[PDB]
């Protein structure tokens, strides 16, 4: 009947969340990664700072 019109419509509808939600997931995992380089810049190495300053 409608040939490829419904194909285009429905397939793009599935696209618009299949790829978009994964893209948002990647953005927020990179945000967690952002916070985590902040954490490791001040968690392990900062424990070593307290150690070396106590040594001094």
């Amino acid at each position: 009947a409608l040939s490829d019109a419904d194909v285009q419509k429905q397939i793009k509808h599935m696209m618009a969340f299949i790829e978009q939600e994964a893209n948002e997931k990647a953005e927020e995992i990179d945000a967690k990664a952002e916070e985590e380089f902040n954490i490791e810049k001040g968690r392990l190495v900062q424990t070593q700072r307290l150690k070396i300053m106590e040594y001094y």
């Binding site: 009947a1 419904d6 194909v7 429905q10 509808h13 599935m14």
Partner: peptide
Amino acid sequence: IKQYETLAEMVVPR
């Protein structure tokens, strides 16, 4: 074989 399109949405056409 013709109503499948309208019987539900967010489905696979054809």
